[PDB]
Design a binder for this molecule. Structure first.
Ligand SMILES: *[C@@H]1O[C@H](CO)[C@@H](O[C@@H]2O[C@H](CO)[C@@H](O)[C@H](O)[C@H]2NC(C)=O)[C@H](O)[C@H]1NC(C)=O
Ligand SMILES: *[C@@H]1O[C@H](CO)[C@@H](O[C@@H]2O[C@H](CO)[C@@H](O)[C@H](O)[C@H]2NC(C)=O)[C@H](O)[C@H]1NC(C)=O
Ligand code: NAG
Ligand code: NAG
Ligand code: NAG
Lengths: 50, 216, 99, 50, 150
């Protein structure tokens, strides 16, 4: 009872690293490199994946 | 000749910092428990350069002095020469060619600076000639096999040459021993300690037992 | 979503503290950057022996490129060309030829 | 200035888009243009616009 | 302009060899002739030709994207450094918000960044002066209300 839940809380952190097929995992790079007209094609994938 | 590798050849995957964690990655490494060619000094031929080379040397008077890389060797390829006692590396990268029996009695870069072990890894990727190096004294002295233990390597030099390479030869002095090992793509797991150094690595392509460790 | 609240406890939202200042930091290199030597040079090399140049340790300004005549092709892959002035780079390689 | 209609049109930021005439991203409308180089061209250039 | 060669090239490579292309079945043996063509040819350019054949000058750039100590970027000016307060910061194109304080982590001379489990940035090195800093998110929490009957 003390073990399983702890593990079920760790994995949720690790899923924050996957890229979900986007350009980069870090959320600031997309807005610091691309343009507003086209960043919406990318942000959607991350939002859905999380 | 032939001799056991005995768990050597691990280098940093990138220039980032971590601490107290387990990580997994894939790159061109040297598989554990791999037989390695052996030579003695007088027997100094040209050896293949398939996909990167692991080079290691035992000496104390620095007989080994340079390398030559090329395909046809008609005075139209790069070479590397050094003048170093123990810790003073001097590099010239011009295209001078010696005679057909080299020995010791664009130039995009230039630099001037028993109880020894030299280790190097040469890698070629996308027009880049990456060179990783490591120096370490050995308290083992002469025995039958290569020194035991574990360590890590560091990245040193990059060069944007961009030429197809197939064969290489070493440069010796005349008036010590060395080894050659081949690279291979593979996936490992590593442990980053508390103080920021690599202390243990695990394969998951060697034995049935290790696959469980890799997947767990 | 009502005009009446029963006795008890409730949880509404969260709170976060706000910043008060802005900080930027950059290296103090102040050498003019030699883009002149390649763009408006006299004679370019041949395709089969294409020429390349290395650029490092300089302060860039990508707006001056607009001083030229109406271009035929000016495109970029991976970076929007407008904000090029807001990113820092390690090494620059530039290739030139004529087609 | 011809293609500067793109600046008049919703999209990326620029001098004409922001400091001369702007249209929001959610704007509903149309932009039409006729090549006036056949007519507006004059001897030694035209300097009647700023 | 190159015309003939046995097979294509890997990206970022050059070849200026003068070997004769063995087009025919006979072995040329380094002798130019029929079915043994010279690898290179020449173009032509006249001022009265059409735009379809006029010469064009082409330049290609290439980038590296902050994977090492950076050396080239714009003329943005620096500022004095403040710590122990909740501040917005920008280090070499890496933007963030939080609190900066002195730390004691030891790095190898070539290192430049520090990460963690969530791949977020934790420790940076000031390019202006060689010393190490870390980042801590600013304080936040949840709120609740207790009330009797209205
Ligand atoms: C560098 O060039 C050599 C030849 O110039 C390539 O060698 C080829 O090797 C394969 C594998 O045995 C042969 O099937 C080919 O016939 C060889 N080429 C020729 C022209 O005979 C070598 O592959 C090149 N390097 C790389 C990385 O591709
Ligand atoms: C990692 O480095 C730390 C220092 O940053 C080492 O901890 C110190 O060890 C010395 C012994 O050589 C003690 O005298 C100090 O008191 C220790 N520091 C503290 C804060 O207690 C640590 O030993 C190193 N890691 C390993 C495995 O040796
Ligand atoms: C390597 O070469 C030696 C030479 O005798 C041989 O005995 C061995 O089976 C080979 N393979 C491995 C994995 O050691
Ligand atoms: C500029 O940067 C160098 C880089 O180390 C630093 O040593 C120096 O103190 C800085 N300031 C001046 C005025 O040179
Ligand atoms: C190249 O020369 C032209 C000459 O008119 C000049 O306008 C242009 O700015 C120069 N290029 C650079 C990068 O300065």
């Amino acid at each position: 009872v003390v073990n399983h839940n702890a593990q079920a809380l760790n994995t949720l952190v690790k899923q924050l690293s996957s890229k979900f097929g986007a350009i980069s995992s870090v959320l600031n790079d997309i807005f610091s490199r691309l343009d507003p007209p086209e960043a919406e094609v990318q942000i959607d994938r991350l939002i859905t994946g999380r | 000749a032939y001799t056991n590798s005995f768990t050597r050849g691990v280098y940093y995957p990138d220039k980032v910092f971590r601490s107290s964690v387990l990580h997994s990655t894939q790159d061109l490494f040297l598989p554990f428990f791999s037989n390695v060619t052996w030579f003695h000094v007088i027997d100094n031929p040209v050896l293949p350069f398939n996909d990167g080379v692991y080079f290691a040397s035992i000496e104390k008077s620095n007989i080994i002095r340079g390398w030559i890389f090329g395909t046809t060797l008609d005075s139209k390829t790069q070479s590397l020469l050094i003048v170093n006692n123990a810790t003073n590396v001097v590099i010239k990268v011009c295209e001078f060619q010696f005679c057909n029996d080299p020995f010791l009695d664009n130039c995009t870069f230039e630099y001037v600076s028993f109880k020894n072990l030299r280790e190097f890894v040469f890698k070629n990727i996308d027009g880049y000639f990456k060179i990783y190096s490591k120096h370490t004294p050995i308290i083992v002295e002469p025995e039958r096999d290569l020194p035991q233990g574990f360590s890590a390597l560091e990245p040193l030099v990059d060069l944007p040459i961009g030429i197809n390479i197939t064969r290489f030869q070493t440069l010796l002095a005349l008036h010590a021993a060395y080894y050659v090992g081949y690279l291979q793509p593979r996936t490992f797991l590593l442990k980053y300690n508390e103080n920021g150094t690599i202390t243990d690595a695990v394969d998951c392509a060697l034995d049935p037992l290790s696959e469980t460790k890799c997947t767990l | 979503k009502s005009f009446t609240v029963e006795k008890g406890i409730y949880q509404t939202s969260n709170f976060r503290v706000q910043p008060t200042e802005s900080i930027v930091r950059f290296p103090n290199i102040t050498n003019l950057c030699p883009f002149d030597e390649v763009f408006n040079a006299t004679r370019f090399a041949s395709v089969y022996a294409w020429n390349r140049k290395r650029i490092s340790n300089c302060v860039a300004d990508y707006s001056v490129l607009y001083n030229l005549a109406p271009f035929f092709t000016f495109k970029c892959y991976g970076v929007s060309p407008t904000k090029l002035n807001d990113l820092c780079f390690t090494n620059v390689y530039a290739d030139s030829f004529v087609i | 200035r011809g293609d500067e209609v793109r600046q008049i049109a919703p999209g990326q930021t620029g001098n004409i888009a922001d400091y001369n005439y702007k249209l929001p991203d959610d704007f509903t409308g149309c932009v039409i243009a006729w090549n006036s180089n056949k007519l507006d061209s004059k001897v030694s250039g035209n300097y009647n616009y700023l | 302009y190159r015309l003939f060669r046995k097979s294509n090239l890997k990206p970022f490579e050059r070849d200026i060899s003068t070997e004769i292309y063995q087009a025919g079945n006979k072995p040329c043996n380094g002798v130019a002739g029929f079915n043994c063509y010279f690898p290179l040819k020449s173009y032509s350019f006249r001022p009265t030709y059409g735009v379809g054949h006029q010469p064009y000058r082409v330049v290609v750039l290439s980038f590296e994207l902050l994977h090492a100590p950076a050396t080239v970027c714009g003329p943005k000016k620096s500022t004095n450094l403040v710590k122990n307060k909740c501040v917005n910061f920008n280090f070499n194109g890496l933007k963030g918000t939080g609190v900066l304080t002195e730390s004691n982590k030891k790095f190898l001379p070539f290192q430049q960044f520090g990460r963690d489990i969530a791949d977020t940035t934790d420790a940076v090195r000031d390019p202006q002066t060689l010393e190490i800093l870390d980042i801590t998110p600013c304080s936040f929490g949840g709120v609740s209300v207790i009330t009797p009957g209205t």
